[PDB]
Design a protein around this ligand. Structure first.
Ligand SMILES: Nc1nc2c(ncn2[C@@H]2O[C@H](COP(=O)(O)OP(=O)(O)OP(=O)(O)O)[C@@H](OP(=O)(O)OP(=O)(O)O)[C@H]2O)c(=O)[nH]1
Ligand SMILES: [Cl-]
Ligand SMILES: [Cl-]
Ligand SMILES: [F-]
Ligand SMILES: [Mg+2]
Ligand SMILES: [Mg+2]
Ligand SMILES: [Mg+2]
Ligand SMILES: [Mg+2]
Lengths: 160, 275
């Protein structure tokens, strides 16, 4: 499996910005919590390959719909709340380890489509102001989000 | 170590904190500690910049006093806030949309690094001041002690009574101020402005604030004086206002339009403190 020896699943997260410097904010399927797209790196893929695959699977965007503006250097880790760990599932996953990508959406909003897959992870999306996710993300991801959005800020605060 | 800045706006010393990229919770105890000039940082007020609550706003910010309580006074800290978020690279926008304890605002940072605030449209209706008078007048007569005074009256959301003087340094702000501030014709009291008109585009001002006496930089008083002066045909559409605390610039196209107030914010220092 992909779970590392500390119990962290390798994962890639996606911050998609438009030309107004808003970021894409997506509603978890059948729930009322919102987040950025993210997903597991599969065996044999690089972080960037997993990113493009999850990107199309979750948001319906192709390579040519986006441009990579930045990515974080090293792994950023968050721990699952103890209550959500499945201790019976071997090897035990206690959290995820993430590389984050900043993408500019270069196509029109209509190219976004959340139902390319059999099992969609989102059922809605909207543009939100850049720092809004730092407040609204679920608590156990907030420290990762704060660091990600801080690192990406200079790049986004440059598209005017 | 928590990063912070010191800034000066409207004659007040702000400690200003980026709580967007820093993870900090401001308990009343932490705030009172930080207010201590020897144990902490020392400040008139603490301005804390946070992520927005609304996806269509850019930021939220709070202001705390040295006692550790959140203060909710309209437009307070707005100029330092707007310059801080640009100076720290939290935004590159010139029109910044922000929520506060009093509602929401659109702040505009000008090319001279001044901050312009939409203060709304002045209301001269006596009933909205509130002011005791039958109908609105550009000038009113009021007896104050055994002296009679001419004045304009307006509400910027709060009540104002504006009196023309020939020199603000030689004004009886300390005797006439109290008498008019709680004058019986102001059932909710009023702020008493003493306006020396230098030019159609330039006034000096002292303000005896409702309940608070003379302060250094009453922003709503600057607005009220310039609104009265314009309503009276004495002032241009854009007026420099010199106050004890510094300079503001007011702009108003008269009834039908909002009035705008533009002011500086000085970035005094950066610092850090371990919490
Ligand atoms: N309350 C709340 N919970 C959230 C939120 N985001 C994620 N979770 C829960 O946290 C657990 C793991 O979520 P994530 O770390 O985001 O990762 P996953 O969605 O599992 O896969 P991914 O990284 O996208 O490949 C799941 O519980 P389960 O493992 O039981 O799976 P579930 O509740 O879905 O039945 C999510 O439901 C949120 O915003 N609010
Ligand atoms: Cl593709
Ligand atoms: Cl406004
Ligand atoms: F996923
Ligand atoms: Mg996912
Ligand atoms: Mg996925
Ligand atoms: Mg996946
Ligand atoms: Mg997944």
């Amino acid at each position: 499996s992909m779970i590392d020896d500390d119990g962290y699943r390798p994962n890639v997260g996606i911050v998609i910005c438009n030309r107004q410097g808003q970021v894409m904010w997506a509603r978890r399927f059948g729930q009322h919590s919102w987040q950025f797209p993210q997903g597991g790196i599969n065996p044999g893929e690089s972080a960037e390959q997993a990113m493009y695959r999850e990107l199309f699977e979750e948001v319906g965007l192709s390579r040519k719909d986006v441009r990579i503006l930045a990515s974080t250097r090293n792994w950023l880790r968050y721990k699952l709340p103890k209550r959500l760990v499945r201790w019976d599932t071997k090897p035990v996953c206690i959290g995820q380890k993430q590389k984050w990508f900043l993408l500019q959406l270069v196509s029109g909003d209509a190219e976004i489509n959340m139902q390319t897959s059999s099992t969609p992870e989102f059922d809605g999306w909207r543009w939100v102001s850049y720092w809004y996710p730092v407040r609204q993300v679920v608590s156990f991801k907030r420290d990762v989000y704060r660091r990600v959005m801080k690192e990406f800020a200079s790049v986004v605060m440059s598209l005017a | 170590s928590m990063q912070f800045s010191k800034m000066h706006g409207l004659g007040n010393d702000f400690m200003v904190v980026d709580a967007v990229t820093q993870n900090v919770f401001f308990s009343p105890e932490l705030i009172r500690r930080l207010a201590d000039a020897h144990l902490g940082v020392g400040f008139d007020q603490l301005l804390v910049v946070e992520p927005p609550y609304d996806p269509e706003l850019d930021f939220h910010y709070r202001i705390f006093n040295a006692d550790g309580s959140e203060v909710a006074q309209c437009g307070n800290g707005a100029r330092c806030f707007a310059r801080f978020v640009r100076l720290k690279g939290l935004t590159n926008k010139r029109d910044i949309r922000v929520s506060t304890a009093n509602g929401r605002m659109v702040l505009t940072v000008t090319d001279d690094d001044l901050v312009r605030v939409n203060m709304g449209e002045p209301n001269f209706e006596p009933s909205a001041v509130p002011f005791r008078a039958n109908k609105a007048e550009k000038t009113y007569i009021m007896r104050a002690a055994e002296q009679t005074i001419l004045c304009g009256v307006v509400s910027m959301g709060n009540p104002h009574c504006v009196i023309q003087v020939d020199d603000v340094d030689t004004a009886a702000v300390e005797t006439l101020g109290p008498v008019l501030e709680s004058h019986e014709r102001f059932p909710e009291r009023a702020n008493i402005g003493f306006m020396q008109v230098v030019k159609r585009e330039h006034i000096r001002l002292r303000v005896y604030e409702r309940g608070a006496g003379e302060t250094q930089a009453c922003g709503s008083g600057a607005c009220a004086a310039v609104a009265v002066g314009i309503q009276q045909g004495l002032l241009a559409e854009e007026v420099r206002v010199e106050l004890p605390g510094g300079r503001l610039d007011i702009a108003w196209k008269g009834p039908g339009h909002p009035l705008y107030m533009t002011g500086p914010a000085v970035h005094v220092a950066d610092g850090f403190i371990h919490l």
